[PDB]
From a paper:
Extensive studies have identified that many RNA-binding proteins, such as FUS, [name], and TDP43, largely contribute to this conditional cellular compartmentation. These proteins commonly contain low complexity (LC) domains that can drive the full-length proteins to undergo liquid–liquid phase separation (LLPS) via weak multivalent interactions. In this work, we directly visualize temperature-sensitive amyloid fibrils in the liquid-like droplets of [name] by transmission electron microscopy (TEM).
As a control, we also determined the atomic structure of segment 234GGGYGGS240 by X-ray diffraction.
Residue numbers in the entry: 234 to 240
Write the structure that this text describes.
């Protein structure tokens, strides 16, 4: 799986 975060 995988993902991200940011802003």
């Amino acid at each position: 799986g995988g993902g991200y975060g940011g802003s």
